[PDB]
Design a protein around this nucleic acid. Structure first.
Ligand SMILES: [Mg+2]
Ligand SMILES: [Mg+2]
Ligand SMILES: [Mg+2]
Ligand SMILES: [Mg+2]
Ligand SMILES: [Mg+2]
Ligand SMILES: [Mg+2]
Ligand SMILES: [Mg+2]
Ligand SMILES: [Mg+2]
Ligand SMILES: [Mg+2]
Ligand SMILES: [Mg+2]
Ligand SMILES: [Mg+2]
Ligand SMILES: [Mg+2]
Ligand SMILES: [Mg+2]
Ligand SMILES: [Mg+2]
Ligand SMILES: [Mg+2]
Ligand SMILES: [Mg+2]
Ligand SMILES: [Mg+2]
Lengths: 117, 150, 140, 56, 110, 103
RNA sequence: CCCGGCGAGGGGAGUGAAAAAGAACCUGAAACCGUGUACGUACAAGCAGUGGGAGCACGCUUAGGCGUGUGACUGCGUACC
RNA sequence: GUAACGGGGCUAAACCAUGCACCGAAGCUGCGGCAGCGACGCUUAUGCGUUGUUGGGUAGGGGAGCGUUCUGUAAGCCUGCGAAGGUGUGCUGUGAGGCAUGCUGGAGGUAUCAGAAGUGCGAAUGCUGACAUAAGUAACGAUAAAGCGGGUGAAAAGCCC
C-alpha cells in the first residue's frame, strides 16, 4: 500500500536525463528533454543510419565517376563495360581504388573501356 | 476528510483555477480517492476440496516425516526443559515438527521461539503439516479410514 | 576498413588559368563550379571541405546565345524598403563585370558556408594576361 | 510588455559582459609611499605638502 | 583548510558581491585594499572584511606571515533568501526575496 | 598484397588487415578449420600482375584466421507516431574477426 | 587563542568513532546558482539533433590505426499533448 | 522584392521521334539475427538445424512479462571487516529492468515460489513546496527642496547640539 514512487521515479528520470552531450539548455537539466529531444534522437537515428547506406554510395560513384572519366569513358560507360564478364564484376565501395591503387583503377578502366563492344 | 465546507474559490476568473470541494483527491491538504474499507478477505473452500490431498507427506517425506510413536505419557506435569530427552528419540528437535496425539494433556508444554508445536487433536490444517520438517503423526490407532484425523 | 578518404582539410590546390574569351560564356560556369570542387579530381571526396584553384581573364568576351545580350534582368535588391529592385540588363552590367556574369558560378555552388569558401577565390579580372594583379606563379 | 519564451540560460550572460567592474590606477605620491588614493596625495594628515585638513 | 575565511549570508545578494569579487584574484593579498579600498559598493566593504580576516589567518592557522600569499580563490555562492510581502495595487505584485551571499576567500602560494 | 571478396557485403577492401565480417553458422568459438576463401581474390592485385579481374589464373584464396567471433554493439533505434511508440527494440550480430594469412 | 563593531561571520585548538554530526545539526537527490580545467566559438541564419566527420586536449598499445571529452565543416531535417 | 523554370543558368541544359547506358525508395536480392504459423530433417515429452511464409498501424480485442510497498517461506540468508537511500562505472536483457562494483552513507535488507495491492505520471488554466525569468529593470508614497560647523561612532546626508 506504499506507492512512494519517489524511488523508481528518480531512476526513470535520471535514465533519459543521462544525455552526456547535454545538447543544450533544458535538453539536459529539465526532464522535458526526454520524449521531446531524447525521443527525437531515436527518431533522427532510425532513418539516418540505414539511410546512410546510400549517402556513401552516392559518394562512391560521385568520386568513382570523377576518377574513371579523367581517362576516357564516364561512370555511365564504366560499369557498362565492367558489366560484361563471366565473373569479372567486383562492385564499387572498394572501387575507391582511385585513391590508393591509382594504377590498378586506371588498369581497371581498360577492363571496361576496351570491354565496351 | 475533515472537509468542512463547499467550494469557496470563485470558479470563472481569478486566472488559473477550477476547483470544487476540498476533499478533492488532488488537494495535498487531504481527501483520498476511493478510500478503502475493512472488507472480509476470508474466502471459503468447499468441504470436500478441503480434505482433498493433505497427508501426502507420508510418501513424499518418506525418509523424513511419516513417523508414529506416542504422546510421551511419562512427561512431568508442566516441564519443557527435559523435552529434549524425548526429542532425541528421533534426533529431530528444532527441526520444527508437530505432534498429533489427540489429547490436550501436559504435552502442550512445547513453548519456544518456533520449533515443536503440539496442536495434537482433530483441529489441524496442512499449512502446519507443511510448515514443519517432520510432522510426527504418532497418536497410534487414531489414524483410521477416511477419518484418520489426528 | 571504413572506406572514405578522410578530410585532408583541402590539401590539394592545383593552379589554372582559363581564358574567359571563349565561345560558350554561360556554359563555362559549370566547368568552373565543377572544378572548384571535385571534377578532374578523383580522391579528395566532395561534400566535405575541398576545392581547387583556377582563374578567369578578360571575361568581357561573352555574348550568351539568344538575345540574352539584352536580358539577364539582374537586380541586386538591398533590404532598404522605399522600393528597391535594381533591374539592369546583362549588356548594361557587362560594362563592369563585377559581382555578376563572371560571378555566375556563385549561384551554381553549394552555397552557404564551405561552398562559399571557393566563390570569388578564383579571381576574375577583365583584360587577360596584360595586368595580372593576381598570383603569377605556376598555372596551366 | 509581454514576454513569450525566456532564454534565461546563456542569454543575459552576454549582457553581463558590459557589467564587469574595472580597476583603478594611481600613485602614492612622495610623502605617502602607498595611499594617495586617486590623484589626491594622502589622507593621514590630509595635505599635498603642508597645512591642509590637520597636518603639522 | 589552506587558510580560508569564507562567510555566510552577509546580506547583499550574490550578483552584487560576485561583481566586486572578480576585481580581485591572482596577485591580490597585498591588495587587501587599493583594488578594494578604492571601489565603493556595499559588496566591496564585505569582501575586504573577510579578506583581512582571511589574510589574518596567516599567523594563526598556518605559517607564512602576511606578505606573500596569492588569493588563488574567490567566489560567492547563493545564500538562503528571506521572504517578505509587498503591499501594492491590491496585493498582486509582492514576493521580495532579500537574497544573501558569502565570499569564501582563499590565500596560498604562487 | 591486396585482395577482395563478398559475403554479406564485399567487405574485403583491405589486404589482410584482420577485419570483422559475418558469422560462421552452427556456432562460433575461435580456433579454426582452415577455410580458404574463393578465387574472388582481386588477383591479389598486388605486383606487376594487378589484373583487371579476379579472373586471372585459377585457384587463389586466402585462409581465414578466426581471431574473434563474438561481441555485439547495441543501438536503441525506436520509432513513434503521435498515438504510440514502439520505443523498445534491439537486434544485433557478433561479426567474426579473421586475420587472413596472405593472398 | 585570532580576524571583527567586546557585530555577524569565520579560522585554529579541543569533545567525539566521526563536527565531511556544531546546533541551519541524520541520509542529503532534483530544479536553480557559481569557481576551475579540455575543446568548440566574433562573416554566420531556422525544434539545435541525427548521419558523416577533420582537428585539438588527455588515455592507447613493443605501430598496429582504437578509448573519453569537445566538436569545425557537411546530407538531412517545423517540439510533446 | 526577381517571385508564373526551385535558383543558377540554358539555343538546345526546349520539344517531337527512336534506341542504349547510368542515377534512383525502408520496393526486391544478398548476409546475419528475432519472433508466430505450415512443412522438412530429424530427433522423436520436448526440442533444435533447414525451409516457405507473416511481422505499418489510431479506437479497440487478445497474449505475455518488469518493477515497487506489504504477507508467508524467514531468529533462514545478507550486513558495522559497513544495510536501505544517493551517486558514478562496467557487464546484461527485445524492453520494462537485472546484477557486480568504486565513492558517499549510517543502519537494516531479503534469492526463491506464492499472496495482496493507496502498484509505475509529462501534461487535467492539476494540489503543496523550492527555485528561475523578466532584472539588478520599475519603484522607494504628495514638488513644504535644504546648507554648514561640532558630538558621538567601526561608519553620519538622515541620530544629539
Ligand atoms: Mg554528379
Ligand atoms: Mg453553500
Ligand atoms: Mg499562467
Ligand atoms: Mg489525509
Ligand atoms: Mg465448514
Ligand atoms: Mg542544399
Ligand atoms: Mg546533513
Ligand atoms: Mg571563424
Ligand atoms: Mg556518427
Ligand atoms: Mg544500374
Ligand atoms: Mg536502398
Ligand atoms: Mg504490429
Ligand atoms: Mg524498505
Ligand atoms: Mg500524457
Ligand atoms: Mg527592460
Ligand atoms: Mg530605463
Ligand atoms: Mg518619502
Amino acid at each position: 500500500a506504499r506507492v512512494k514512487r519517489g524511488v523508481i521515479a528518480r531512476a526513470r528520470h535520471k535514465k533519459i536525463l543521462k544525455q552526456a552531450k547535454g545538447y543544450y539548455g533544458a535538453r539536459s537539466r529539465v526532464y522535458r528533454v526526454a520524449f521531446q529531444a531524447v525521443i527525437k534522437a531515436g527518431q533522427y537515428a532510425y532513418r539516418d543510419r540505414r539511410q546512410r547506406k546510400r549517402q556513401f554510395r552516392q559518394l562512391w560513384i560521385a568520386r568513382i565517376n570523377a576518377a574513371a572519366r579523367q581517362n576516357g569513358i564516364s561512370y555511365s560507360k564504366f560499369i557498362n563495360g565492367l558489366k560484361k564478364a563471366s565473373v569479372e564484376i567486383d562492385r564499387k565501395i572498394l572501387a575507391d581504388i582511385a585513391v590508393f591503387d591509382k594504377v590498378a583503377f586506371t588498369a581497371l578502366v581498360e577492363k571496361a573501356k576496351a570491354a565496351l563492344a | 476528510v475533515t472537509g468542512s465546507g463547499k467550494k469557496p474559490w470563485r470558479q470563472k476568473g481569478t486566472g488559473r483555477a477550477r476547483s470544487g470541494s476540498i476533499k478533492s483527491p488532488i488537494w495535498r491538504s487531504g481527501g483520498v480517492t476511493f478510500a478503502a474499507r475493512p472488507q472480509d478477505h476470508s474466502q471459503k473452500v468447499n468441504k470436500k476440496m478441503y480434505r482433498g490431498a493433505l497427508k501426502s507427506i507420508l510418501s513424499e517425506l518418506v525418509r523424513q516425516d511419516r513417523l508414529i510413536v506416542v504422546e510421551k505419557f511419562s512427561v512431568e506435569a508442566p516441564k519443557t526443559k527435559l523435552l529434549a530427552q524425548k526429542l532425541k528419540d528421533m534426533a529431530l528437535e528444532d527441526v520444527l515438527i508437530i505432534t498429533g496425539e489427540l489429547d490436550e494433556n501436559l504435552f502442550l508444554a512445547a513453548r519456544n521461539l518456533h520449533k515443536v508445536d503440539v496442536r495434537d487433536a482433530t483441529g489441524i490444517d496442512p499449512v502446519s503439516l507443511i510448515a514443519f520438517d517432520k510432522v510426527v503423526m504418532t497418536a497410534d490407532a487414531v489414524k483410521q479410514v477416511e477419518e484418520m484425523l489426528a | 576498413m571504413k572506406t572514405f578518404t578522410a578530410k585532408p582539410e583541402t590539401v590539394k590546390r592545383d593552379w589554372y588559368v582559363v581564358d574567359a574569351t571563349g565561345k560558350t560564356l554561360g556554359r563555362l560556369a559549370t566547368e568552373l563550379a565543377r572544378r572548384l570542387r571535385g571534377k578532374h579530381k578523383a580522391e579528395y571526396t566532395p561534400h566535405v571541405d575541398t576545392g581547387d584553384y583556377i582563374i578567369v581573364l578578360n571575361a568581357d568576351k561573352v555574348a550568351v546565345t539568344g538575345n540574352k545580350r539584352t536580358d539577364k534582368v539582374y537586380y541586386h535588391h538591398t533590404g532598404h524598403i522605399g522600393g528597391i529592385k535594381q533591374a539592369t540588363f546583362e549588356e548594361m552590367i557587362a560594362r563592369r563585370p563585377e559581382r555578376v556574369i563572371e560571378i555566375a558560378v556563385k549561384g551554381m555552388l553549394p552555397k552557404g558556408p564551405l561552398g562559399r569558401a571557393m566563390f570569388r577565390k578564383l579571381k576574375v579580372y577583365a583584360g587577360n594576361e596584360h595586368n595580372h594583379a593576381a598570383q603569377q606563379p605556376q598555372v596551366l | 510588455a509581454v514576454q513569450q519564451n525566456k532564454p534565461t540560460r546563456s542569454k543575459r550572460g552576454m549582457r553581463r559582459s558590459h557589467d564587469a567592474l574595472t580597476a583603478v590606477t594611481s600613485l602614492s605620491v612622495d610623502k605617502t609611499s602607498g595611499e594617495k588614493h586617486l590623484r589626491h596625495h594622502i589622507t593621514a594628515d590630509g595635505y599635498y605638502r603642508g597645512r591642509k585638513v590637520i597636518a603639522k | 583548510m589552506e587558510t580560508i575565511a569564507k562567510h555566510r549570508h552577509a546580506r547583499s545578494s550574490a550578483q552584487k558581491v560576485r561583481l566586486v569579487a572578480d576585481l580581485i584574484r591572482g596577485k591580490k593579498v597585498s591588495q587587501a585594499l587599493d583594488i578594494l579600498t578604492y571601489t565603493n559598493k556595499k559588496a566591496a566593504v564585505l569582501v575586504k572584511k573577510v579578506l583581512e580576516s582571511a589574510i589574518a589567518n596567516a599567523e594563526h592557522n598556518d605559517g607564512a606571515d602576511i606578505d606573500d600569499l596569492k588569493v588563488t580563490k574567490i567566489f560567492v555562492d547563493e545564500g538562503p533568501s528571506m521572504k517578505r510581502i509587498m503591499p501594492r495595487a491590491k496585493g498582486r505584485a509582492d514576493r521580495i526575496l532579500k537574497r544573501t551571499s558569502h565570499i569564501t576567500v582563499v590565500v596560498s602560494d604562487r | 598484397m591486396y585482395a577482395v571478396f563478398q559475403s554479406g557485403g564485399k567487405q574485403h577492401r583491405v589486404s589482410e588487415g584482420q577485419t570483422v565480417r559475418l558469422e560462421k553458422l552452427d556456432i562460433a568459438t575461435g580456433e579454426t578449420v582452415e577455410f580458404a576463401e574463393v578465387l574472388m581474390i582481386a588477383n591479389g592485385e598486388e605486383v606487376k600482375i594487378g589484373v583487371p579481374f579476379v579472373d586471372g589464373g585459377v585457384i587463389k584464396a586466402e585462409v581465414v584466421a578466426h581471431g574473434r567471433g563474438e561481441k555485439v554493439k547495441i543501438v536503441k533505434f525506436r520509432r513513434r507516431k503521435h498515438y504510440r511508440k514502439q520505443q523498445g527494440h534491439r537486434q544485433w550480430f557478433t561479426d567474426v574477426k579473421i586475420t587472413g594469412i596472405s593472398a
